[PDB]
Amino acid sequence: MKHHHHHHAPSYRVKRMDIAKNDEECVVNAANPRGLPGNGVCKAVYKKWPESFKNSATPVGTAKTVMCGTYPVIHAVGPNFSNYSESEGDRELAAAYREVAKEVTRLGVNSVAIPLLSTGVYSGGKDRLTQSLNHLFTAMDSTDADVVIYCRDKEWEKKISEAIQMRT
Ligand SMILES: [Ca+2]
Ligand SMILES: [Cl-]
Ligand SMILES: [Cl-]
Ligand SMILES: [Cl-]
Ligand SMILES: [Cl-]
């Protein structure tokens, strides 16, 4: 059974920087179903933890953890909204985050670095910040890990921070 330090109060934070530089105990990749190096976040994850791509292929709506050494990389496959309808894509996006929460719990980590799934090249050309962040919260709220959300856009940083602060 998992125990924490007496001071542990689970938190959310957002940082605008490359998730490959994260200071957390594990990382969530914005993965593609075939386990390819990809682009954007996925390519940064591939450059930093290439060993974690051994047998990382997994279906849309799921997560698969592969260790790089002892450092866990949770490959979470959100839907490409160019291929899915809005209703089906929304369900798969929510499902991918639920699988992340299960993996974070199983691993026993105290913290996790997470990107906003399906907000980059899989967004179908739409702004999906609120949709993706709300599914992240829905899955992660019941976990006790410190969650650090990574983004790259300055306006997105502000909106994510606002959403975090308004629930506190
Ligand atoms: Ca699926
Ligand atoms: Cl950076
Ligand atoms: Cl892809
Ligand atoms: Cl994406
Ligand atoms: Cl961003």
Short mmCIF file of N, CA and C and ligand atoms in Angstrom, two decimals:
data_model
loop_
_atom_site.label_atom_id
_atom_site.label_comp_id
_atom_site.label_asym_id
_atom_site.label_seq_id
_atom_site.Cartn_x
_atom_site.Cartn_y
_atom_site.Cartn_z
N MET A 1 0.85 -1.23 0.00
CA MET A 1 0.00 0.00 0.00
C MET A 1 0.87 1.26 0.00
N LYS A 2 0.37 2.30 -0.66
CA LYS A 2 1.11 3.54 -0.87
C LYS A 2 0.86 4.51 0.28
N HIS A 3 1.95 5.03 0.84
CA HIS A 3 1.91 6.08 1.85
C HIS A 3 2.67 7.29 1.34
N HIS A 4 2.36 8.45 1.91
CA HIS A 4 2.97 9.71 1.51
C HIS A 4 3.62 10.39 2.71
N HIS A 5 4.36 11.46 2.42
CA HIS A 5 4.88 12.32 3.47
C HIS A 5 3.75 13.13 4.09
N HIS A 6 3.88 13.40 5.39
CA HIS A 6 2.82 14.08 6.12
C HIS A 6 2.42 15.40 5.46
N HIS A 7 3.33 16.01 4.71
CA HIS A 7 3.04 17.29 4.06
C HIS A 7 2.31 17.14 2.74
N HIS A 8 2.24 15.94 2.17
CA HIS A 8 1.66 15.81 0.84
C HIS A 8 0.24 16.35 0.84
N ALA A 9 0.04 17.39 0.06
CA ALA A 9 -1.29 17.91 -0.30
C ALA A 9 -1.31 17.91 -1.83
N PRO A 10 -2.14 17.08 -2.46
CA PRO A 10 -2.10 16.99 -3.92
C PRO A 10 -2.45 18.32 -4.56
N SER A 11 -1.71 18.67 -5.63
CA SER A 11 -1.81 19.97 -6.26
C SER A 11 -1.83 19.82 -7.78
N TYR A 12 -2.29 20.88 -8.45
CA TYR A 12 -2.13 21.09 -9.88
C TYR A 12 -1.30 22.35 -10.09
N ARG A 13 -0.39 22.29 -11.06
CA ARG A 13 0.39 23.45 -11.48
C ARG A 13 0.50 23.39 -13.00
N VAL A 14 0.79 24.53 -13.62
CA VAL A 14 1.05 24.59 -15.06
C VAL A 14 2.37 25.30 -15.30
N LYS A 15 3.14 24.80 -16.26
CA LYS A 15 4.40 25.38 -16.67
C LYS A 15 4.46 25.44 -18.18
N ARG A 16 5.00 26.53 -18.70
CA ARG A 16 5.14 26.71 -20.14
C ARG A 16 6.60 26.42 -20.49
N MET A 17 6.86 25.21 -20.94
CA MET A 17 8.21 24.74 -21.26
C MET A 17 8.09 23.34 -21.85
N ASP A 18 9.21 22.83 -22.34
CA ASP A 18 9.29 21.50 -22.93
C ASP A 18 9.15 20.46 -21.83
N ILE A 19 8.14 19.59 -21.97
CA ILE A 19 7.90 18.50 -21.01
C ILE A 19 9.08 17.54 -20.91
N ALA A 20 9.97 17.52 -21.90
CA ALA A 20 11.18 16.71 -21.81
C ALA A 20 12.11 17.18 -20.69
N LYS A 21 11.91 18.38 -20.16
CA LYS A 21 12.69 18.95 -19.07
C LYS A 21 11.95 18.87 -17.73
N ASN A 22 10.92 18.02 -17.64
CA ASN A 22 10.07 18.05 -16.45
C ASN A 22 10.85 17.59 -15.22
N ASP A 23 10.34 18.00 -14.05
CA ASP A 23 10.94 17.68 -12.75
C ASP A 23 10.05 16.73 -11.95
N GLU A 24 9.24 15.92 -12.62
CA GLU A 24 8.29 15.02 -11.98
C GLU A 24 8.77 13.57 -12.08
N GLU A 25 8.10 12.68 -11.36
CA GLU A 25 8.53 11.29 -11.24
C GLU A 25 8.17 10.45 -12.45
N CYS A 26 7.33 10.94 -13.35
CA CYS A 26 6.99 10.22 -14.56
C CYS A 26 6.41 11.24 -15.54
N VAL A 27 6.28 10.82 -16.79
CA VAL A 27 5.80 11.70 -17.85
C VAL A 27 4.72 11.00 -18.64
N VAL A 28 3.74 11.77 -19.09
CA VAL A 28 2.72 11.28 -20.02
C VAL A 28 3.11 11.78 -21.41
N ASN A 29 3.25 10.85 -22.35
CA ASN A 29 3.46 11.22 -23.75
C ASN A 29 2.12 11.43 -24.44
N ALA A 30 2.06 12.44 -25.30
CA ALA A 30 0.95 12.63 -26.23
C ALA A 30 1.25 11.75 -27.44
N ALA A 31 0.97 10.46 -27.27
CA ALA A 31 1.44 9.41 -28.16
C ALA A 31 0.50 9.20 -29.34
N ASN A 32 1.03 8.55 -30.36
CA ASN A 32 0.24 8.07 -31.48
C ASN A 32 0.06 6.56 -31.37
N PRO A 33 -0.97 6.00 -31.99
CA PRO A 33 -1.30 4.58 -31.74
C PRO A 33 -0.21 3.61 -32.16
N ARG A 34 0.63 3.98 -33.11
CA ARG A 34 1.63 3.08 -33.65
C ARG A 34 2.98 3.17 -32.97
N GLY A 35 3.11 4.01 -31.95
CA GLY A 35 4.39 4.11 -31.26
C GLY A 35 5.49 4.74 -32.07
N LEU A 36 5.14 5.65 -32.99
CA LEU A 36 6.11 6.31 -33.84
C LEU A 36 6.65 7.57 -33.17
N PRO A 37 7.82 8.04 -33.60
CA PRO A 37 8.40 9.26 -33.00
C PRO A 37 7.51 10.48 -33.12
N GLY A 38 6.77 10.60 -34.22
CA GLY A 38 5.79 11.68 -34.30
C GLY A 38 6.41 13.06 -34.42
N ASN A 39 5.69 14.04 -33.87
CA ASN A 39 6.09 15.45 -33.94
C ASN A 39 5.65 16.13 -32.64
N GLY A 40 6.03 17.38 -32.48
CA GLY A 40 5.62 18.11 -31.29
C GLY A 40 6.06 17.43 -30.01
N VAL A 41 5.15 17.37 -29.04
CA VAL A 41 5.46 16.75 -27.75
C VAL A 41 6.00 15.33 -27.93
N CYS A 42 5.33 14.55 -28.79
CA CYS A 42 5.72 13.15 -28.95
C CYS A 42 7.17 13.02 -29.41
N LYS A 43 7.59 13.89 -30.34
CA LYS A 43 8.98 13.85 -30.81
C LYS A 43 9.95 14.28 -29.72
N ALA A 44 9.57 15.26 -28.90
CA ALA A 44 10.42 15.63 -27.76
C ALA A 44 10.58 14.46 -26.79
N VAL A 45 9.49 13.73 -26.55
CA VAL A 45 9.55 12.56 -25.69
C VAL A 45 10.42 11.49 -26.32
N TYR A 46 10.33 11.33 -27.64
CA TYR A 46 11.17 10.34 -28.32
C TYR A 46 12.65 10.71 -28.22
N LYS A 47 12.98 11.99 -28.34
CA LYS A 47 14.39 12.39 -28.26
C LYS A 47 14.96 12.15 -26.86
N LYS A 48 14.15 12.34 -25.82
CA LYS A 48 14.64 12.26 -24.45
C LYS A 48 14.61 10.84 -23.89
N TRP A 49 13.59 10.06 -24.23
CA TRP A 49 13.39 8.71 -23.71
C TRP A 49 13.11 7.72 -24.84
N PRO A 50 14.02 7.59 -25.81
CA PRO A 50 13.71 6.71 -26.95
C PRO A 50 13.49 5.27 -26.55
N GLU A 51 14.14 4.80 -25.48
CA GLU A 51 14.00 3.42 -25.05
C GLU A 51 12.57 3.09 -24.65
N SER A 52 11.79 4.11 -24.30
CA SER A 52 10.42 3.91 -23.87
C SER A 52 9.48 3.62 -25.03
N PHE A 53 9.96 3.68 -26.26
CA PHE A 53 9.12 3.41 -27.42
C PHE A 53 9.17 1.95 -27.84
N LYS A 54 9.87 1.10 -27.09
CA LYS A 54 9.87 -0.33 -27.36
C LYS A 54 8.49 -0.88 -27.04
N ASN A 55 7.76 -1.32 -28.06
CA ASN A 55 6.44 -1.91 -27.88
C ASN A 55 5.47 -0.96 -27.17
N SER A 56 5.51 0.31 -27.54
CA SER A 56 4.61 1.31 -26.96
C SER A 56 3.31 1.48 -27.74
N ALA A 57 3.18 0.87 -28.91
CA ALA A 57 1.95 0.99 -29.68
C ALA A 57 0.75 0.51 -28.87
N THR A 58 -0.35 1.25 -28.95
CA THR A 58 -1.54 0.98 -28.15
C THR A 58 -2.72 1.69 -28.79
N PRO A 59 -3.95 1.21 -28.60
CA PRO A 59 -5.09 1.80 -29.32
C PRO A 59 -5.46 3.20 -28.85
N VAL A 60 -6.20 3.90 -29.71
CA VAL A 60 -6.79 5.18 -29.34
C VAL A 60 -7.67 4.99 -28.12
N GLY A 61 -7.57 5.94 -27.19
CA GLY A 61 -8.34 5.87 -25.97
C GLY A 61 -7.70 5.08 -24.85
N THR A 62 -6.45 4.66 -25.01
CA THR A 62 -5.76 3.86 -24.00
C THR A 62 -4.43 4.51 -23.66
N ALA A 63 -3.81 3.98 -22.61
CA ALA A 63 -2.46 4.37 -22.21
C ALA A 63 -1.65 3.10 -21.96
N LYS A 64 -0.37 3.16 -22.31
CA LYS A 64 0.56 2.05 -22.11
C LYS A 64 1.85 2.61 -21.54
N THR A 65 2.28 2.10 -20.39
CA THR A 65 3.50 2.57 -19.75
C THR A 65 4.68 1.70 -20.15
N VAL A 66 5.77 2.34 -20.54
CA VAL A 66 7.04 1.68 -20.80
C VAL A 66 8.12 2.43 -20.04
N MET A 67 8.99 1.68 -19.34
CA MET A 67 10.06 2.29 -18.57
C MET A 67 11.21 2.70 -19.48
N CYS A 68 11.81 3.83 -19.17
CA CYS A 68 13.12 4.21 -19.70
C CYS A 68 14.05 4.15 -18.49
N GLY A 69 14.81 3.07 -18.37
CA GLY A 69 15.51 2.83 -17.11
C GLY A 69 14.50 2.48 -16.04
N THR A 70 14.39 3.31 -14.99
CA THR A 70 13.29 3.19 -14.03
C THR A 70 12.30 4.35 -14.16
N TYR A 71 12.46 5.21 -15.16
CA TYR A 71 11.60 6.38 -15.32
C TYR A 71 10.39 6.01 -16.18
N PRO A 72 9.16 6.08 -15.66
CA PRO A 72 8.01 5.62 -16.47
C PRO A 72 7.57 6.67 -17.48
N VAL A 73 7.33 6.22 -18.70
CA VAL A 73 6.73 7.02 -19.75
C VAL A 73 5.36 6.42 -20.04
N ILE A 74 4.31 7.16 -19.77
CA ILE A 74 2.93 6.72 -19.96
C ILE A 74 2.49 7.22 -21.32
N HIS A 75 2.42 6.33 -22.30
CA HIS A 75 2.03 6.70 -23.66
C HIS A 75 0.51 6.71 -23.75
N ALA A 76 -0.07 7.90 -23.78
CA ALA A 76 -1.52 8.09 -23.80
C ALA A 76 -1.93 8.53 -25.20
N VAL A 77 -2.85 7.78 -25.81
CA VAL A 77 -3.23 8.01 -27.19
C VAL A 77 -4.60 8.68 -27.21
N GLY A 78 -4.61 9.99 -27.38
CA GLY A 78 -5.84 10.68 -27.66
C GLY A 78 -6.25 10.51 -29.12
N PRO A 79 -7.51 10.80 -29.42
CA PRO A 79 -8.01 10.68 -30.79
C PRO A 79 -7.53 11.82 -31.67
N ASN A 80 -7.36 11.51 -32.95
CA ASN A 80 -7.18 12.55 -33.97
C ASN A 80 -8.57 12.99 -34.42
N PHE A 81 -8.95 14.21 -34.04
CA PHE A 81 -10.29 14.69 -34.37
C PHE A 81 -10.51 14.90 -35.86
N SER A 82 -9.47 14.82 -36.69
CA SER A 82 -9.68 14.78 -38.14
C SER A 82 -10.36 13.49 -38.58
N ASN A 83 -10.21 12.41 -37.80
CA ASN A 83 -10.74 11.10 -38.15
C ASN A 83 -12.02 10.74 -37.41
N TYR A 84 -12.20 11.25 -36.20
CA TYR A 84 -13.34 10.91 -35.36
C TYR A 84 -14.39 12.00 -35.47
N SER A 85 -15.66 11.61 -35.29
CA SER A 85 -16.69 12.61 -35.08
C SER A 85 -16.45 13.32 -33.74
N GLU A 86 -17.14 14.44 -33.54
CA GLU A 86 -16.97 15.17 -32.28
C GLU A 86 -17.40 14.33 -31.08
N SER A 87 -18.53 13.63 -31.18
CA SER A 87 -19.02 12.85 -30.05
C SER A 87 -18.11 11.66 -29.76
N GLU A 88 -17.70 10.92 -30.80
CA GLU A 88 -16.83 9.77 -30.58
C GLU A 88 -15.44 10.20 -30.13
N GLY A 89 -14.92 11.27 -30.73
CA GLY A 89 -13.61 11.76 -30.31
C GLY A 89 -13.62 12.23 -28.87
N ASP A 90 -14.70 12.89 -28.46
CA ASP A 90 -14.81 13.32 -27.07
C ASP A 90 -14.76 12.13 -26.13
N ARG A 91 -15.45 11.03 -26.48
CA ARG A 91 -15.43 9.85 -25.62
C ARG A 91 -14.04 9.22 -25.54
N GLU A 92 -13.35 9.12 -26.67
CA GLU A 92 -12.00 8.54 -26.66
C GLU A 92 -11.01 9.41 -25.89
N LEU A 93 -11.15 10.74 -25.99
CA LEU A 93 -10.27 11.65 -25.26
C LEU A 93 -10.46 11.48 -23.76
N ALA A 94 -11.72 11.44 -23.31
CA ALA A 94 -11.98 11.21 -21.89
C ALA A 94 -11.40 9.87 -21.45
N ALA A 95 -11.54 8.84 -22.29
CA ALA A 95 -11.05 7.50 -21.95
C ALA A 95 -9.53 7.47 -21.81
N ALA A 96 -8.81 8.14 -22.70
CA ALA A 96 -7.35 8.16 -22.59
C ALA A 96 -6.92 8.73 -21.25
N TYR A 97 -7.53 9.83 -20.82
CA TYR A 97 -7.17 10.39 -19.53
C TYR A 97 -7.53 9.46 -18.37
N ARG A 98 -8.67 8.75 -18.44
CA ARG A 98 -8.98 7.79 -17.38
C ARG A 98 -7.89 6.72 -17.28
N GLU A 99 -7.37 6.26 -18.42
CA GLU A 99 -6.30 5.27 -18.38
C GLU A 99 -5.02 5.86 -17.79
N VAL A 100 -4.74 7.14 -18.07
CA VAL A 100 -3.58 7.79 -17.44
C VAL A 100 -3.73 7.76 -15.92
N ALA A 101 -4.92 8.09 -15.41
CA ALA A 101 -5.10 8.12 -13.95
C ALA A 101 -4.88 6.75 -13.34
N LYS A 102 -5.34 5.69 -14.02
CA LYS A 102 -5.09 4.33 -13.54
C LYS A 102 -3.59 4.02 -13.52
N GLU A 103 -2.87 4.38 -14.57
CA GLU A 103 -1.44 4.10 -14.60
C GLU A 103 -0.68 4.89 -13.55
N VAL A 104 -1.00 6.18 -13.38
CA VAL A 104 -0.34 6.98 -12.35
C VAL A 104 -0.55 6.34 -10.99
N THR A 105 -1.78 5.87 -10.72
CA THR A 105 -2.08 5.22 -9.45
C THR A 105 -1.30 3.92 -9.30
N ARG A 106 -1.32 3.06 -10.33
CA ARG A 106 -0.61 1.78 -10.27
C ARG A 106 0.88 1.96 -10.00
N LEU A 107 1.48 2.98 -10.62
CA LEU A 107 2.91 3.21 -10.49
C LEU A 107 3.30 3.74 -9.11
N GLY A 108 2.37 4.32 -8.37
CA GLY A 108 2.70 4.79 -7.04
C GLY A 108 3.50 6.07 -7.00
N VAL A 109 3.56 6.80 -8.10
CA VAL A 109 4.37 8.00 -8.16
C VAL A 109 3.73 9.11 -7.35
N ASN A 110 4.58 10.04 -6.89
CA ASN A 110 4.13 11.22 -6.17
C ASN A 110 3.79 12.38 -7.08
N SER A 111 4.24 12.35 -8.33
CA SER A 111 4.03 13.45 -9.26
C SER A 111 4.07 12.92 -10.69
N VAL A 112 3.44 13.68 -11.58
CA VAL A 112 3.35 13.33 -12.99
C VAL A 112 3.31 14.60 -13.83
N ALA A 113 4.05 14.60 -14.94
CA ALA A 113 4.06 15.65 -15.95
C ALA A 113 3.12 15.25 -17.08
N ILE A 114 2.16 16.12 -17.40
CA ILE A 114 1.10 15.78 -18.36
C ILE A 114 0.95 16.90 -19.39
N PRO A 115 0.83 16.56 -20.70
CA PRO A 115 0.42 17.55 -21.70
C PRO A 115 -1.08 17.46 -21.95
N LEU A 116 -1.65 18.45 -22.64
CA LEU A 116 -3.07 18.40 -22.99
C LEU A 116 -3.27 17.57 -24.26
N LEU A 117 -3.82 16.38 -24.08
CA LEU A 117 -4.01 15.46 -25.20
C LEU A 117 -4.96 16.04 -26.24
N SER A 118 -4.66 15.73 -27.49
CA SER A 118 -5.45 16.05 -28.67
C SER A 118 -5.59 17.56 -28.91
N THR A 119 -4.68 18.37 -28.37
CA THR A 119 -4.73 19.80 -28.60
C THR A 119 -3.75 20.30 -29.65
N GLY A 120 -2.86 19.45 -30.13
CA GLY A 120 -1.90 19.79 -31.16
C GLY A 120 -2.36 19.32 -32.53
N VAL A 121 -1.53 18.53 -33.21
CA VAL A 121 -1.87 18.08 -34.56
C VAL A 121 -3.11 17.20 -34.61
N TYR A 122 -3.53 16.61 -33.48
CA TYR A 122 -4.75 15.82 -33.43
C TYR A 122 -6.01 16.64 -33.14
N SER A 123 -5.91 17.96 -33.08
CA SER A 123 -7.06 18.77 -32.69
C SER A 123 -8.06 18.98 -33.82
N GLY A 124 -7.75 18.53 -35.03
CA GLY A 124 -8.65 18.81 -36.15
C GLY A 124 -8.79 20.28 -36.46
N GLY A 125 -7.79 21.09 -36.12
CA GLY A 125 -7.80 22.50 -36.41
C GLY A 125 -8.62 23.36 -35.47
N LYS A 126 -9.04 22.82 -34.33
CA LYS A 126 -9.88 23.54 -33.39
C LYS A 126 -9.13 23.76 -32.08
N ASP A 127 -9.50 24.81 -31.36
CA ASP A 127 -8.98 25.08 -30.02
C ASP A 127 -9.70 24.17 -29.04
N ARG A 128 -8.96 23.21 -28.45
CA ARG A 128 -9.54 22.22 -27.56
C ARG A 128 -9.00 22.32 -26.14
N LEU A 129 -8.46 23.48 -25.75
CA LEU A 129 -7.91 23.64 -24.40
C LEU A 129 -8.92 23.24 -23.34
N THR A 130 -10.10 23.86 -23.35
CA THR A 130 -11.06 23.61 -22.28
C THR A 130 -11.55 22.17 -22.29
N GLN A 131 -11.86 21.65 -23.47
CA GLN A 131 -12.30 20.26 -23.59
C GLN A 131 -11.27 19.30 -23.01
N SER A 132 -10.01 19.47 -23.40
CA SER A 132 -8.99 18.53 -22.95
C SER A 132 -8.67 18.70 -21.46
N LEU A 133 -8.55 19.95 -21.01
CA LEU A 133 -8.26 20.21 -19.60
C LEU A 133 -9.37 19.67 -18.71
N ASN A 134 -10.63 19.85 -19.12
CA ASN A 134 -11.72 19.35 -18.28
C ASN A 134 -11.71 17.82 -18.21
N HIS A 135 -11.34 17.13 -19.30
CA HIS A 135 -11.22 15.68 -19.20
C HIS A 135 -10.02 15.27 -18.35
N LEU A 136 -8.93 16.04 -18.41
CA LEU A 136 -7.80 15.81 -17.51
C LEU A 136 -8.24 15.90 -16.06
N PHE A 137 -8.92 16.99 -15.69
CA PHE A 137 -9.41 17.12 -14.31
C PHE A 137 -10.35 15.97 -13.94
N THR A 138 -11.27 15.62 -14.84
CA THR A 138 -12.24 14.57 -14.51
C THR A 138 -11.52 13.28 -14.13
N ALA A 139 -10.45 12.94 -14.84
CA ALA A 139 -9.71 11.73 -14.53
C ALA A 139 -8.78 11.90 -13.33
N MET A 140 -8.05 13.02 -13.26
CA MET A 140 -6.98 13.13 -12.28
C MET A 140 -7.45 13.62 -10.91
N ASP A 141 -8.67 14.18 -10.82
CA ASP A 141 -9.09 14.77 -9.56
C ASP A 141 -9.09 13.75 -8.44
N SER A 142 -9.38 12.48 -8.74
CA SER A 142 -9.46 11.45 -7.71
C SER A 142 -8.11 10.82 -7.39
N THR A 143 -7.04 11.23 -8.08
CA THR A 143 -5.70 10.79 -7.74
C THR A 143 -5.09 11.77 -6.74
N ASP A 144 -4.08 11.30 -6.01
CA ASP A 144 -3.38 12.15 -5.05
C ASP A 144 -1.98 12.55 -5.50
N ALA A 145 -1.65 12.35 -6.77
CA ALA A 145 -0.37 12.80 -7.29
C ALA A 145 -0.37 14.31 -7.50
N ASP A 146 0.80 14.92 -7.33
CA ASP A 146 1.00 16.28 -7.80
C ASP A 146 1.04 16.24 -9.32
N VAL A 147 0.18 17.01 -9.97
CA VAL A 147 0.07 17.03 -11.42
C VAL A 147 0.66 18.34 -11.92
N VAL A 148 1.58 18.26 -12.88
CA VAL A 148 2.18 19.43 -13.50
C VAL A 148 1.82 19.37 -14.97
N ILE A 149 1.03 20.33 -15.42
CA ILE A 149 0.57 20.39 -16.80
C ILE A 149 1.58 21.21 -17.57
N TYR A 150 2.01 20.71 -18.74
CA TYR A 150 2.99 21.40 -19.58
C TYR A 150 2.31 21.91 -20.83
N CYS A 151 2.57 23.16 -21.18
CA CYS A 151 2.06 23.75 -22.42
C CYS A 151 3.18 24.57 -23.04
N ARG A 152 2.93 25.11 -24.23
CA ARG A 152 3.94 25.90 -24.92
C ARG A 152 3.47 27.30 -25.28
N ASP A 153 2.17 27.54 -25.34
CA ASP A 153 1.63 28.82 -25.78
C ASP A 153 1.36 29.72 -24.57
N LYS A 154 1.74 31.00 -24.70
CA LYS A 154 1.65 31.89 -23.55
C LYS A 154 0.21 32.17 -23.14
N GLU A 155 -0.70 32.29 -24.11
CA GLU A 155 -2.10 32.50 -23.76
C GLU A 155 -2.71 31.25 -23.16
N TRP A 156 -2.31 30.06 -23.64
CA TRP A 156 -2.81 28.84 -23.03
C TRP A 156 -2.33 28.71 -21.59
N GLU A 157 -1.08 29.08 -21.31
CA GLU A 157 -0.60 29.05 -19.94
C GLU A 157 -1.51 29.86 -19.03
N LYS A 158 -1.88 31.07 -19.47
CA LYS A 158 -2.72 31.93 -18.65
C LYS A 158 -4.08 31.30 -18.40
N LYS A 159 -4.70 30.74 -19.44
CA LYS A 159 -6.03 30.17 -19.30
C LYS A 159 -6.02 28.91 -18.44
N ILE A 160 -4.99 28.07 -18.58
CA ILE A 160 -4.87 26.88 -17.73
C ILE A 160 -4.68 27.29 -16.28
N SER A 161 -3.80 28.27 -16.05
CA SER A 161 -3.58 28.75 -14.70
C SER A 161 -4.86 29.32 -14.10
N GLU A 162 -5.62 30.08 -14.89
CA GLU A 162 -6.89 30.61 -14.41
C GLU A 162 -7.84 29.49 -14.02
N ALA A 163 -7.88 28.42 -14.81
CA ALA A 163 -8.80 27.33 -14.53
C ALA A 163 -8.39 26.59 -13.26
N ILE A 164 -7.09 26.41 -13.05
CA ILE A 164 -6.59 25.80 -11.82
C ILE A 164 -6.95 26.65 -10.61
N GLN A 165 -6.68 27.96 -10.68
CA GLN A 165 -6.84 28.83 -9.53
C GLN A 165 -8.30 29.01 -9.15
N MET A 166 -9.20 28.96 -10.13
CA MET A 166 -10.60 29.25 -9.85
C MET A 166 -11.29 28.11 -9.12
N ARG A 167 -10.75 26.88 -9.20
CA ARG A 167 -11.29 25.78 -8.42
C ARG A 167 -10.72 25.71 -7.01
N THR A 168 -9.74 26.56 -6.68
CA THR A 168 -9.18 26.60 -5.33
C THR A 168 -9.73 27.80 -4.55
CA CA B 1 -10.76 3.42 -28.40
CL CL B 2 11.77 24.84 -22.70
CL CL B 3 0.24 9.93 -35.88
CL CL B 4 -2.06 16.36 -30.40
CL CL B 5 0.20 24.85 -25.74
#
